[PDB]
Amino acid sequence: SKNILVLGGSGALGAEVVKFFKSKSWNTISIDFRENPNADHSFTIKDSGEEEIKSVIEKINSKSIKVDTFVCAAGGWSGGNASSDEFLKSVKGMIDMNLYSAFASAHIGAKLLNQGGLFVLTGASAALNRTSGMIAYGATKAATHHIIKDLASENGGLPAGSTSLGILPVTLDTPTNRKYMSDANFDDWTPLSEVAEKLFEWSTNSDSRPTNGSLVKFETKSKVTTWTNL
Amino acid sequence: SKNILVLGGSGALGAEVVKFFKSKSWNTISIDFRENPNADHSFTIKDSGEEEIKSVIEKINSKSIKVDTFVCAAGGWSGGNASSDEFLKSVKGMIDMNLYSAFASAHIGAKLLNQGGLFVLTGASAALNRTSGMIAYGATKAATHHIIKDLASENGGLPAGSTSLGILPVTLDTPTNRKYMSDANFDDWTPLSEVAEKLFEWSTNSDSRPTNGSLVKFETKSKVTTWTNL
Ligand SMILES: NC(=O)c1ccc[n+]([C@@H]2O[C@H](COP(=O)([O-])OP(=O)(O)OC[C@H]3O[C@@H](n4cnc5c(N)ncnc54)[C@H](O)[C@@H]3O)[C@@H](O)[C@H]2O)c1
Ligand SMILES: NC(=O)c1ccc[n+]([C@@H]2O[C@H](COP(=O)([O-])OP(=O)(O)OC[C@H]3O[C@@H](n4cnc5c(N)ncnc54)[C@H](O)[C@@H]3O)[C@@H](O)[C@H]2O)c1
């Protein structure tokens, strides 16, 4: 009876990953700033700080469960180049939403994940190139990609045989995106269930995994999604 | 009169940059947690947060100065992999010391840099590769490197004709390194005054500047220092 943990499990991608692993009879666990009442186990943190992270790790070590797959689907987006009015505020918000969660993920993986397990961070494809219109987002995502790679090392702190991977979306199909970019071709965005699907593939079948430390970019074009190992 | 502004202006490197510029008759300005009385103007910030950064820019601005060279020499080092006891602390330490200050520099440069100005962040050579034993330092430095590249773009927010560079030491000769690697051969460490001299050459001879956005690695071997643009 296999266990998955999802940091950001109340977000759009987060809850899809939960709905999906639950239909497939895995035990689902969720960590977020708000409850997700559709998970089998569901926790609230106040922030991504040391105190709150330790205190959530201890609550799961009390239920005596260890996870086979951990996905961080936590994050957020804000815009702005260095001279924009919103720049300084986008700094705090991207560090809190993207970086602290990525780092929290590492610790959580190091304490809760079983040998052989899957450890997945959500990066951003955009951050593989220049992000001069969204500096804080690009840089905090670039740090995400760096941590994913560090954790693929023997001595990185995850248990033996575990695979550390990055998933890197171009664009996701969320009600949010559909609201704030209503012009767009929705057929060029990734259904969330597709992401959950690939995540199940990797989680049930170890042979399907890409090499440890792979950043994996996915882009949807006319409803067809292509996954590329980078 | 030419102005240089230095974030981290009271640290070992930061204070050597001030001293050396002051000797070539530049006007020097220092922002740090404590004053640098050797500088011509010295400012204190209680933190690297939005409000503190707005104020010190607002202060320097209302004094009518713009700067020809900006250098961020702020930062810190802390160790630890993802499973180690000090890991969560090292996360918050490295975010506050390296990432918040690189982000603050972007803003300070966008607001105070003169057209044609030189803008330099301190990155890390080791963050070019895996930093498994020091994940928080490696990731915040990787983010620093990405900021440097975003600030090279004409859309990044720095003024027309400016040049954004990273200097990426293998090993500086600083009290920090003396403390942690006191067995080393010190002749394989870069003297801080050579860092200052290279900065000065780029500040006064715009032709000697590397490509906008280069991460410039430098390493000393038996007192011979080699600078490599990446
Ligand atoms: N949606 C897109 O088009 C797109 C594109 C590229 C990358 N991404 C990344 O996909 C991931 C999820 O996207 P989404 O569209 O589902 O986002 P969403 O905003 O719907 O969900 C994100 C969740 O993360 C939570 N969160 C924020 N900071 C946290 C922290 N520090 N610790 C724990 N939880 C935190 C939020 O509370 C929210 O519940 C994010 O990493 C996002 O950066 C999304
Ligand atoms: N030699 C190496 O191996 C190596 C490699 C790469 C980078 N570095 C970097 O060298 C740089 C300078 O080192 P040092 O020995 O002079 O260190 P130092 O500790 O003497 O000085 C750093 C200064 O930065 C200030 N500071 C810290 N965080 C700040 C912030 N958020 N905003 C403003 N000021 C802040 C501190 O108060 C201190 O005055 C740092 O950026 C460090 O990350 C060293």
Coordinates of C-alpha atoms and ligand atoms in Angstrom, one line a residue:
Chain A
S1 CA 0.0 0.0 0.0
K2 CA 2.0 2.9 -1.4
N3 CA 2.2 6.4 0.0
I4 CA 2.5 9.8 -1.9
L5 CA 3.2 13.2 -0.3
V6 CA 2.4 16.5 -2.1
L7 CA 3.8 19.8 -0.9
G8 CA 1.4 22.4 -2.4
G9 CA -1.2 19.7 -2.4
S10 CA -4.0 22.3 -2.3
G11 CA -3.0 24.0 -5.5
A12 CA -4.3 23.3 -9.0
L13 CA -1.5 20.9 -10.0
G14 CA -1.2 19.8 -6.3
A15 CA -4.9 18.7 -5.9
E16 CA -4.9 17.0 -9.3
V17 CA -1.9 14.9 -8.3
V18 CA -3.9 14.1 -5.2
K19 CA -7.2 13.3 -6.9
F20 CA -5.3 11.1 -9.3
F21 CA -3.1 9.0 -7.0
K22 CA -6.2 8.5 -4.9
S23 CA -8.3 7.1 -7.7
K24 CA -5.4 4.6 -8.1
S25 CA -5.6 3.5 -4.4
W26 CA -2.3 5.1 -3.2
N27 CA -2.6 6.8 0.2
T28 CA -2.4 10.5 -0.4
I29 CA -0.9 13.1 2.0
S30 CA -1.0 16.9 1.5
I31 CA 1.0 19.9 2.9
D32 CA -0.2 23.4 2.2
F33 CA -1.2 26.9 3.6
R34 CA -4.8 25.7 3.4
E35 CA -6.6 22.4 4.0
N36 CA -7.2 19.9 1.1
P37 CA -10.1 17.9 2.5
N38 CA -9.9 15.3 -0.4
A39 CA -6.6 13.8 0.6
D40 CA -6.5 10.8 3.1
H41 CA -4.1 12.9 5.3
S42 CA -4.0 16.7 5.2
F43 CA -1.8 19.3 7.0
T44 CA -1.5 23.0 7.4
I45 CA 1.6 25.0 7.8
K46 CA 1.8 28.7 8.6
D47 CA 5.0 29.2 6.6
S48 CA 7.9 27.3 5.0
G49 CA 10.2 28.1 7.9
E50 CA 12.4 25.7 9.9
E51 CA 9.9 25.5 12.9
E52 CA 6.9 24.7 10.7
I53 CA 8.7 22.2 8.5
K54 CA 10.2 20.2 11.5
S55 CA 6.8 20.3 13.2
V56 CA 5.1 18.9 10.1
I57 CA 7.8 16.2 9.6
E58 CA 7.2 15.1 13.2
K59 CA 3.4 14.7 12.7
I60 CA 4.0 12.3 9.8
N61 CA 6.7 10.3 11.7
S62 CA 3.9 9.8 14.4
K63 CA 1.6 8.2 11.8
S64 CA 4.7 5.9 11.2
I65 CA 4.5 6.4 7.4
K66 CA 7.2 6.8 4.9
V67 CA 6.7 7.9 1.4
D68 CA 7.4 6.3 -1.9
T69 CA 6.8 9.4 -4.1
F70 CA 7.2 13.0 -3.0
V71 CA 6.1 15.8 -5.4
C72 CA 6.4 19.5 -4.6
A73 CA 3.7 21.3 -6.6
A74 CA 4.0 24.4 -4.5
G75 CA 5.0 27.7 -6.1
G76 CA 3.6 30.9 -7.6
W77 CA 4.3 33.5 -10.3
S78 CA 4.8 37.3 -10.2
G79 CA 6.2 39.5 -12.9
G80 CA 8.7 42.4 -13.0
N81 CA 12.1 43.5 -14.2
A82 CA 14.5 45.3 -11.9
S83 CA 13.2 48.8 -12.4
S84 CA 9.5 47.9 -12.1
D85 CA 7.5 49.2 -9.1
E86 CA 6.5 45.7 -8.2
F87 CA 10.1 44.3 -8.2
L88 CA 10.9 44.3 -4.5
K89 CA 7.6 42.8 -3.6
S90 CA 8.0 40.1 -6.2
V91 CA 11.4 39.2 -4.6
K92 CA 9.8 38.3 -1.2
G93 CA 6.8 36.5 -2.8
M94 CA 8.9 34.3 -5.3
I95 CA 11.4 33.4 -2.5
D96 CA 8.7 32.4 -0.1
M97 CA 6.6 30.6 -2.7
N98 CA 9.2 28.9 -4.9
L99 CA 12.5 28.7 -3.1
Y100 CA 11.6 28.0 0.5
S101 CA 9.2 25.3 -0.6
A102 CA 11.9 23.8 -2.9
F103 CA 14.3 23.8 0.1
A104 CA 11.6 22.4 2.5
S105 CA 11.0 19.7 0.0
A106 CA 14.7 18.7 0.2
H107 CA 14.5 18.3 4.0
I108 CA 11.2 16.4 3.9
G109 CA 12.6 14.1 1.3
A110 CA 15.6 13.5 3.4
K111 CA 13.5 12.4 6.4
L112 CA 10.3 10.9 5.0
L113 CA 11.2 9.3 1.7
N114 CA 11.8 5.5 1.5
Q115 CA 14.8 3.9 -0.2
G116 CA 14.1 3.6 -3.9
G117 CA 11.6 6.5 -3.9
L118 CA 10.7 9.2 -6.3
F119 CA 11.5 12.8 -5.5
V120 CA 10.0 15.4 -7.9
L121 CA 10.3 19.2 -7.9
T122 CA 8.3 21.5 -10.2
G123 CA 10.7 24.0 -11.9
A124 CA 9.9 26.2 -14.9
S125 CA 11.0 25.8 -18.5
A126 CA 11.1 29.5 -18.9
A127 CA 13.9 29.6 -16.3
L128 CA 16.2 27.7 -18.6
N129 CA 16.5 31.0 -20.6
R130 CA 16.5 34.7 -19.8
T131 CA 13.6 35.9 -17.6
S132 CA 14.3 39.7 -17.7
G133 CA 10.5 40.4 -17.4
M134 CA 10.2 38.2 -14.3
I135 CA 13.6 38.3 -12.6
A136 CA 12.6 36.9 -9.2
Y137 CA 10.6 34.1 -10.7
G138 CA 13.4 33.1 -13.1
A139 CA 16.1 33.1 -10.4
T140 CA 14.1 31.3 -7.8
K141 CA 13.2 28.6 -10.4
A142 CA 16.8 28.5 -11.5
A143 CA 17.7 27.7 -7.9
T144 CA 14.9 25.0 -7.9
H145 CA 16.7 23.3 -10.9
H146 CA 20.0 23.5 -9.0
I147 CA 18.6 21.8 -5.9
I148 CA 17.0 18.9 -8.0
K149 CA 20.5 18.3 -9.5
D150 CA 22.3 18.4 -6.1
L151 CA 19.9 15.8 -4.7
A152 CA 20.8 13.4 -7.4
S153 CA 24.2 13.0 -5.8
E154 CA 25.1 10.1 -3.6
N155 CA 25.9 12.5 -0.7
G156 CA 23.0 15.0 -1.3
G157 CA 20.9 13.7 1.6
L158 CA 18.2 11.6 0.0
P159 CA 18.1 7.9 0.8
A160 CA 19.9 5.2 -1.4
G161 CA 18.4 4.3 -4.8
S162 CA 16.0 7.2 -4.8
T163 CA 15.6 9.3 -8.0
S164 CA 15.5 13.1 -7.9
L165 CA 13.8 14.7 -10.9
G166 CA 12.6 18.1 -12.0
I167 CA 9.3 18.6 -14.0
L168 CA 9.5 21.9 -16.0
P169 CA 6.3 23.2 -17.5
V170 CA 6.0 25.8 -20.3
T171 CA 2.3 26.3 -19.4
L172 CA -0.3 24.5 -17.3
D173 CA -4.1 24.4 -17.9
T174 CA -5.4 26.1 -14.7
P175 CA -8.6 28.0 -14.2
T176 CA -6.3 30.9 -13.1
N177 CA -4.3 30.8 -16.4
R178 CA -7.6 30.7 -18.3
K179 CA -8.9 33.8 -16.4
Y180 CA -5.8 35.9 -16.8
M181 CA -4.8 34.9 -20.3
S182 CA -8.2 34.3 -21.7
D183 CA -7.0 35.2 -25.2
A184 CA -4.6 32.3 -25.4
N185 CA -4.8 29.0 -27.4
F186 CA -5.7 26.6 -24.5
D187 CA -4.7 23.6 -26.7
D188 CA -1.0 24.6 -26.2
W189 CA -1.3 24.1 -22.4
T190 CA -0.8 21.0 -20.4
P191 CA -3.8 19.3 -18.8
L192 CA -3.1 18.7 -15.2
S193 CA -4.3 15.1 -15.3
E194 CA -1.4 14.5 -17.8
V195 CA 1.1 15.6 -15.4
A196 CA -0.4 13.5 -12.7
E197 CA -0.4 10.6 -15.2
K198 CA 3.4 10.9 -16.0
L199 CA 4.0 11.2 -12.3
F200 CA 2.1 7.8 -11.7
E201 CA 4.1 6.2 -14.5
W202 CA 7.3 7.1 -12.8
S203 CA 6.0 6.1 -9.4
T204 CA 4.8 2.6 -10.3
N205 CA 7.5 1.6 -12.7
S206 CA 11.1 2.3 -11.9
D207 CA 12.4 1.5 -15.5
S208 CA 10.4 4.5 -16.9
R209 CA 12.4 7.0 -14.9
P210 CA 14.8 9.2 -16.6
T211 CA 18.4 9.4 -15.3
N212 CA 18.8 10.8 -11.8
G213 CA 19.0 14.6 -11.8
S214 CA 17.2 15.1 -15.1
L215 CA 15.3 18.3 -15.6
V216 CA 12.3 17.2 -17.7
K217 CA 10.7 19.8 -19.8
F218 CA 7.1 19.4 -21.1
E219 CA 5.3 21.3 -23.7
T220 CA 1.8 20.8 -25.1
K221 CA 1.1 21.6 -28.8
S222 CA -2.3 21.1 -30.3
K223 CA -3.3 18.8 -27.3
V224 CA -0.1 16.7 -27.8
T225 CA 2.3 16.8 -25.0
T226 CA 6.1 16.1 -25.5
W227 CA 8.4 15.3 -22.6
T228 CA 12.1 16.1 -23.1
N229 CA 14.9 15.0 -20.7
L230 CA 17.4 17.9 -20.1
Chain B
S1 CA 34.3 62.8 -9.9
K2 CA 33.3 59.1 -10.3
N3 CA 31.1 57.2 -7.8
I4 CA 31.3 53.6 -6.8
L5 CA 28.7 52.0 -4.6
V6 CA 29.3 48.8 -2.7
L7 CA 26.6 46.6 -1.0
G8 CA 28.5 44.6 1.6
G9 CA 30.8 47.6 1.8
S10 CA 32.0 46.7 5.3
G11 CA 32.9 43.0 4.6
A12 CA 36.5 41.9 3.9
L13 CA 36.1 42.2 0.1
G14 CA 33.7 45.1 0.2
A15 CA 36.1 47.2 2.4
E16 CA 39.1 46.4 0.2
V17 CA 37.1 47.6 -2.9
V18 CA 36.3 50.8 -1.0
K19 CA 39.9 51.3 0.1
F20 CA 41.3 50.7 -3.4
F21 CA 38.8 53.0 -5.2
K22 CA 39.3 55.7 -2.6
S23 CA 43.1 55.6 -3.4
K24 CA 42.4 56.2 -7.1
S25 CA 40.3 59.3 -6.1
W26 CA 36.8 57.9 -6.7
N27 CA 34.1 58.9 -4.4
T28 CA 33.0 55.7 -2.4
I29 CA 29.6 54.7 -0.9
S30 CA 28.9 51.7 1.3
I31 CA 25.7 50.0 2.3
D32 CA 26.0 47.2 4.9
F33 CA 24.6 46.2 8.4
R34 CA 27.3 48.3 10.1
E35 CA 29.0 51.5 8.9
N36 CA 32.3 51.7 6.9
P37 CA 33.8 54.9 8.3
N38 CA 36.6 54.7 5.7
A39 CA 34.0 55.3 3.0
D40 CA 33.0 58.8 1.9
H41 CA 29.4 57.9 2.4
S42 CA 28.2 55.0 4.6
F43 CA 24.7 53.7 5.0
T44 CA 23.3 51.1 7.4
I45 CA 20.3 48.8 6.7
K46 CA 18.5 46.9 9.4
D47 CA 17.6 44.3 6.8
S48 CA 17.5 43.5 3.1
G49 CA 13.7 43.8 2.9
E50 CA 11.5 45.9 0.7
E51 CA 11.3 48.9 3.0
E52 CA 15.0 49.1 4.0
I53 CA 16.1 48.9 0.4
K54 CA 13.6 51.6 -0.8
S55 CA 14.9 53.9 2.0
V56 CA 18.5 53.7 1.4
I57 CA 17.9 54.2 -2.4
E58 CA 15.5 57.0 -1.4
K59 CA 18.3 58.5 0.8
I60 CA 21.1 58.3 -1.7
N61 CA 18.8 59.6 -4.5
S62 CA 17.7 62.7 -2.4
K63 CA 21.5 63.4 -2.1
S64 CA 21.7 63.6 -5.9
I65 CA 24.4 60.9 -6.5
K66 CA 24.4 58.4 -9.3
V67 CA 27.0 55.7 -9.6
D68 CA 29.4 54.7 -12.3
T69 CA 30.2 51.3 -10.8
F70 CA 28.1 49.2 -8.4
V71 CA 29.5 46.1 -6.7
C72 CA 27.7 43.6 -4.5
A73 CA 30.2 42.1 -2.1
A74 CA 27.5 41.1 0.4
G75 CA 26.9 37.4 1.1
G76 CA 28.0 34.5 3.4
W77 CA 28.8 30.9 3.4
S78 CA 27.1 28.0 5.3
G79 CA 27.4 24.2 4.8
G80 CA 25.2 21.3 4.8
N81 CA 23.4 18.7 2.7
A82 CA 19.7 18.0 2.8
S83 CA 19.7 15.5 5.7
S84 CA 22.1 17.3 8.0
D85 CA 21.1 19.0 11.3
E86 CA 22.0 22.5 10.2
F87 CA 20.2 22.3 6.9
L88 CA 17.1 24.4 7.6
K89 CA 19.1 27.1 9.3
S90 CA 21.6 27.1 6.4
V91 CA 18.6 27.7 4.0
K92 CA 17.4 30.9 5.8
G93 CA 21.0 32.1 6.3
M94 CA 22.0 31.8 2.6
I95 CA 18.7 33.3 1.4
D96 CA 19.1 36.3 3.6
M97 CA 22.8 36.9 3.0
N98 CA 23.2 36.0 -0.7
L99 CA 19.9 36.0 -2.5
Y100 CA 18.1 39.0 -0.8
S101 CA 21.3 41.0 -1.4
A102 CA 21.6 40.0 -5.1
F103 CA 18.0 41.0 -5.5
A104 CA 18.5 44.3 -3.7
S105 CA 21.5 45.0 -6.0
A106 CA 19.2 44.6 -9.1
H107 CA 16.9 47.3 -7.7
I108 CA 19.8 49.6 -6.5
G109 CA 21.4 49.4 -9.9
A110 CA 18.2 50.0 -11.9
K111 CA 17.6 53.2 -9.7
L112 CA 21.1 54.6 -9.2
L113 CA 23.4 53.4 -12.0
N114 CA 24.5 55.9 -14.7
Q115 CA 24.1 55.0 -18.3
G116 CA 27.3 53.1 -19.4
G117 CA 27.8 52.0 -15.8
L118 CA 29.4 48.8 -14.5
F119 CA 27.3 46.5 -12.4
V120 CA 28.9 43.5 -10.6
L121 CA 27.6 40.7 -8.5
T122 CA 29.8 38.2 -6.5
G123 CA 28.7 34.7 -7.6
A124 CA 30.6 31.5 -6.9
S125 CA 32.8 29.3 -9.0
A126 CA 31.6 26.2 -7.1
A127 CA 28.0 26.9 -8.1
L128 CA 28.9 26.2 -11.7
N129 CA 28.7 22.5 -10.7
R130 CA 27.2 20.3 -8.0
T131 CA 27.2 21.6 -4.5
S132 CA 25.8 18.6 -2.7
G133 CA 27.6 19.3 0.5
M134 CA 26.3 22.9 0.6
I135 CA 23.0 22.9 -1.1
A136 CA 21.7 26.2 0.2
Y137 CA 24.8 28.2 -0.7
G138 CA 25.0 26.5 -4.2
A139 CA 21.3 27.2 -5.0
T140 CA 21.4 30.9 -3.9
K141 CA 24.6 31.4 -5.8
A142 CA 23.0 29.7 -8.9
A143 CA 20.1 32.2 -8.5
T144 CA 22.7 35.0 -8.3
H145 CA 24.3 33.9 -11.5
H146 CA 20.8 33.9 -13.3
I147 CA 20.2 37.4 -12.1
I148 CA 23.4 38.6 -13.5
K149 CA 22.3 37.2 -16.9
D150 CA 18.8 38.7 -16.7
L151 CA 20.4 42.2 -15.9
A152 CA 22.6 41.9 -19.1
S153 CA 19.4 42.1 -21.2
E154 CA 18.3 45.5 -22.5
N155 CA 14.8 44.7 -21.0
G156 CA 16.2 43.7 -17.5
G157 CA 16.0 47.3 -16.1
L158 CA 19.5 48.6 -15.9
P159 CA 20.2 51.8 -17.8
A160 CA 21.3 52.0 -21.5
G161 CA 24.9 50.8 -22.2
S162 CA 25.5 49.2 -18.8
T163 CA 27.4 45.9 -18.3
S164 CA 26.2 43.3 -15.8
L165 CA 29.0 40.8 -14.7
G166 CA 29.5 38.1 -12.1
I167 CA 32.9 37.6 -10.5
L168 CA 33.2 34.0 -9.4
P169 CA 36.2 33.3 -7.2
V170 CA 37.6 29.8 -6.6
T171 CA 39.2 31.0 -3.4
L172 CA 39.6 34.6 -2.1
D173 CA 42.0 35.4 0.7
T174 CA 39.4 36.4 3.4
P175 CA 39.2 35.8 7.2
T176 CA 36.4 33.4 6.3
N177 CA 38.7 31.2 4.2
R178 CA 41.5 31.5 6.7
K179 CA 39.2 30.1 9.3
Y180 CA 37.8 27.2 7.3
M181 CA 40.8 26.2 5.3
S182 CA 43.7 27.3 7.5
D183 CA 45.9 24.3 6.2
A184 CA 45.8 25.6 2.6
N185 CA 48.6 27.0 0.6
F186 CA 47.6 30.7 0.9
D187 CA 49.6 31.5 -2.3
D188 CA 46.8 29.7 -4.2
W189 CA 44.3 32.3 -2.8
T190 CA 43.4 35.5 -4.6
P191 CA 44.4 38.7 -2.8
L192 CA 41.4 41.0 -2.3
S193 CA 43.4 43.9 -3.8
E194 CA 43.6 41.9 -7.1
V195 CA 39.9 41.7 -7.1
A196 CA 39.7 45.5 -6.6
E197 CA 42.3 46.2 -9.3
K198 CA 40.3 44.1 -11.9
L199 CA 37.1 46.0 -10.9
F200 CA 39.0 49.3 -11.4
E201 CA 40.3 48.3 -14.8
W202 CA 36.8 47.5 -15.9
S203 CA 35.5 50.7 -14.4
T204 CA 37.9 53.0 -16.3
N205 CA 38.6 51.0 -19.6
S206 CA 35.2 50.0 -21.0
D207 CA 37.0 48.1 -23.8
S208 CA 38.5 45.7 -21.3
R209 CA 35.0 44.6 -20.2
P210 CA 33.9 41.1 -20.8
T211 CA 30.7 40.4 -22.8
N212 CA 27.7 41.7 -21.0
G213 CA 26.4 38.9 -18.7
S214 CA 29.6 36.9 -18.5
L215 CA 30.3 35.0 -15.3
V216 CA 34.0 35.7 -14.7
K217 CA 35.8 32.8 -12.9
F218 CA 39.2 33.6 -11.3
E219 CA 41.7 31.3 -9.6
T220 CA 45.2 32.0 -8.3
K221 CA 48.0 29.3 -8.5
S222 CA 51.3 30.1 -6.8
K223 CA 50.4 33.9 -6.9
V224 CA 49.5 34.0 -10.7
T225 CA 45.8 34.9 -11.0
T226 CA 43.9 33.8 -14.1
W227 CA 40.5 35.4 -15.1
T228 CA 38.3 33.3 -17.4
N229 CA 35.0 34.7 -18.9
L230 CA 32.3 32.1 -19.1
Ligands
LIG1 N1 0.6 27.0 -13.8 C1 1.5 27.3 -14.9 O1 1.2 27.7 -16.0 C2 3.0 27.0 -14.5 C3 4.1 27.2 -15.4 C4 5.4 26.9 -15.0 C5 5.7 26.4 -13.7 N2 4.6 26.2 -12.8 C6 4.8 25.8 -11.4 O2 3.8 24.7 -11.2 C7 3.6 24.6 -9.8 C8 2.2 24.6 -9.4 O3 1.5 25.4 -10.2 P1 -0.1 25.7 -9.9 O4 -0.5 26.3 -11.2 O5 -0.7 24.4 -9.5 O6 -0.1 26.7 -8.7 P2 -1.2 27.2 -7.7 O7 -1.0 28.6 -7.3 O8 -2.6 26.8 -8.1 O9 -0.8 26.2 -6.5 C9 0.4 26.5 -5.7 C10 0.2 26.1 -4.2 O10 1.5 26.2 -3.5 C11 1.2 26.8 -2.2 N3 2.4 27.4 -1.7 C12 3.0 28.6 -2.0 N4 4.2 28.7 -1.3 C13 4.3 27.6 -0.5 C14 5.3 27.3 0.4 N5 6.3 28.0 0.6 N6 5.1 26.1 1.0 C15 4.0 25.3 0.8 N7 3.1 25.6 -0.1 C16 3.2 26.8 -0.8 C17 0.1 27.8 -2.4 O11 -0.5 28.1 -1.2 C18 -0.8 27.0 -3.4 O12 -1.7 26.2 -2.6 C19 4.3 25.8 -9.2 O13 5.6 25.3 -8.8 C20 4.4 26.7 -10.3 O14 5.5 27.6 -10.0 C21 3.3 26.5 -13.2
LIG2 N1 36.5 32.6 -1.9 C1 35.4 31.7 -2.1 O1 35.5 30.5 -2.1 C2 34.1 32.4 -2.5 C3 33.5 31.9 -3.7 C4 32.3 32.5 -4.1 C5 31.7 33.6 -3.4 N2 32.3 34.1 -2.3 C6 31.6 35.3 -1.6 O2 32.5 36.3 -1.2 C7 31.7 37.5 -0.9 C8 32.5 38.4 0.1 O3 33.1 37.6 1.1 P1 33.7 38.2 2.5 O4 34.8 37.2 2.9 O5 34.1 39.6 2.1 O6 32.6 38.1 3.5 P2 32.3 39.0 4.8 O7 31.5 38.1 5.7 O8 33.5 39.7 5.3 O9 31.4 40.2 4.3 C9 30.1 40.1 3.7 C10 29.4 41.5 4.1 O10 28.1 41.4 3.6 C11 27.2 42.0 4.5 N3 25.9 41.4 4.2 C12 25.5 40.1 4.4 N4 24.2 40.0 3.9 C13 23.8 41.2 3.4 C14 22.6 41.7 2.8 N5 21.5 41.0 2.6 N6 22.6 43.0 2.4 C15 23.6 43.8 2.6 N7 24.7 43.4 3.2 C16 24.9 42.1 3.6 C17 27.8 41.4 5.9 O11 27.3 42.3 6.9 C18 29.3 41.6 5.6 O12 29.5 43.0 6.0 C19 30.4 36.9 -0.5 O13 29.4 37.3 -1.5 C20 30.6 35.4 -0.4 O14 29.3 34.8 -0.7 C21 33.5 33.5 -1.8

